[PDB]
Write a protein that binds this ligand. Structure first.
Ligand SMILES: [Ca+2]
Ligand SMILES: [Ca+2]
Ligand SMILES: [Ca+2]
Ligand SMILES: [Ca+2]
Ligand SMILES: [Ca+2]
Ligand SMILES: [Ca+2]
Ligand SMILES: [Ca+2]
Ligand SMILES: [Ca+2]
Ligand SMILES: [Ca+2]
Ligand SMILES: [Ca+2]
Lengths: 129, 123, 46
């Protein structure tokens, strides 16, 4: 019930890509690989195990992360965060790459842990439909 | 005139410590070094300029906690396919802000990890 | 490679952190403090 190249798991189709893209480009690319396509959404431990296996069999890098579809929607650098002294945050000097509001799977943690990483990174990914 | 072990700037007192602590411990320790004390807060680029220098002159190149914690915990995290966020598998529970003594750029580090720090209070 | 102790207190270094040890995107970026350089370094790194 899935296109050739894709793998089926509990009603959905999954496909890993060894392409190096930013989170934005990856998400967009997925929306184009199939109707209703998106970066993978890991909603249960079982699906996490299925995806980890899919990644281990089609990525193998020992480096770089694998994008998943969970990230901070807004464009803020920090949310509802106030200085410990009690004052509001107005002035800020974040390095864009230090604002790790995207998530990726990584080899060291068996591709089953979501690691906070910079969205502008260029990594492989997994699409889901 | 800030305590002998501190440094003054714009009516405030600042002091960098070498004892390594995670974010929470650092902040609590600061509230115990003098009344109204907390982890250093950068409300302006001028203040940050002062602190970075003070920190580097004292201990040189290192990393120091700033008064910001759990920076993304209450952000609007959402799946791109709009699935509800229930199951979770975070590698780290929360991130805190710090600075590297070579410049005033803001950086993130897991709050459970260690770093040096700078306390501050209004004179 | 981050052992998770006090090593990140020391100035980054490609040899110590990326050659003698396996390093992440961010560890390399901490040395270059420039994104394009890191991404680049990454292509030829993996
Ligand atoms: Ca899913
Ligand atoms: Ca302040
Ligand atoms: Ca190391
Ligand atoms: Ca390192
Ligand atoms: Ca480093
Ligand atoms: Ca060597
Ligand atoms: Ca080593
Ligand atoms: Ca680091
Ligand atoms: Ca960093
Ligand atoms: Ca280039």
């Amino acid at each position: 019930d899935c296109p050739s190249g894709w793998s089926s798991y509990e009603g959905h189709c999954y496909k890993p890509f060894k392409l190096y893209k930013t989170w934005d480009d990856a998400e967009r690319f997925c929306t184009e690989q199939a109707k209703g396509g998106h970066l993978v959404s890991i909603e249960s431990a079982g699906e996490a195990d299925f995806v980890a296996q899919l990644v281990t069999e089609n990525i193998q890098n020992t480096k770089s992360y694998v994008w998943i579809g969970l990230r901070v929607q807004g464009k803020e650098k920090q949310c509802s965060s106030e200085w410990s002294d009690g004052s509001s945050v107005s002035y800020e000097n974040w390095i864009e790459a230090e604002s790790k509001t995207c998530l990726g799977l990584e080899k060291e943690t068996g591709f089953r842990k979501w690691v906070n990483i910079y969205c502008g990174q260029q990594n492989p990914f997994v699409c889901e439909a | 005139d800030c305590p002998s072990d501190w440094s003054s700037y714009e009516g405030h007192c600042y002091k960098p410590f070498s004892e390594p602590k995670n974010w929470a411990d650092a902040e609590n320790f600061c509230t115990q070094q003098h009344a109204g004390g907390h982890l250093v807060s950068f409300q302006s680029s001028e203040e940050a300029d002062f602190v970075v220098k003070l920190a580097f002159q004292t201990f040189g190149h290192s990393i120091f906690w700033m008064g910001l914690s759990n920076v993304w915990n209450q952000c609007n995290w959402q799946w791109s396919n709009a699935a509800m966020l229930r199951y979770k598998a975070w590698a780290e529970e929360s991130y805190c802000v710090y600075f590297k003594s070579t410049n005033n750029k803001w950086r993130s580090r897991a709050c459970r990890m260690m770093a040096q720090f700078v306390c501050e209070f209004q004179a | 490679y981050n052992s998770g102790k006090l090593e990140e207190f020391v100035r980054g270094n490609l040899e110590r952190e990326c050659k003698e040890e396996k390093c992440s995107f961010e560890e390399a970026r901490e040395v270059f403090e420039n994104t394009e350089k890191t991404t680049e370094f990454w292509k030829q790194y993996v």
